[PDB]
Amino acid sequence: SPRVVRIVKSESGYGFNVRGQVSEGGQLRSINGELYAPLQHVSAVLPGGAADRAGVRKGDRILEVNGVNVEGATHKQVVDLIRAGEKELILTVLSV
């Protein structure tokens, strides 16, 4: 089920990598049996980093960034949203 995590940036960043499609939209793919448009996901978590401590997990799919729905979003849209805040990031994620 979707959950919200708050992550405070360190000087070296949030401590995770995001990976996913360049383009907008695309074929539906269910995540834990629920239909969604394509989602960007967390492809790495820095051990001991901010994301790790906040409970972000490898493979987490990203549904919202800073209160903005990113279902079907381009990679650039999600990166730009993650970078929107000076030091805080709020994600809605789905663990797989």
């Binding site: 401590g15 995770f16 995001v18 990976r19 996913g20 499609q21 360049v22 993650i82």
Partner: peptide
Amino acid sequence: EEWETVM
């Protein structure tokens, strides 16, 4: 096509 970024 997929891209990865370090955040």
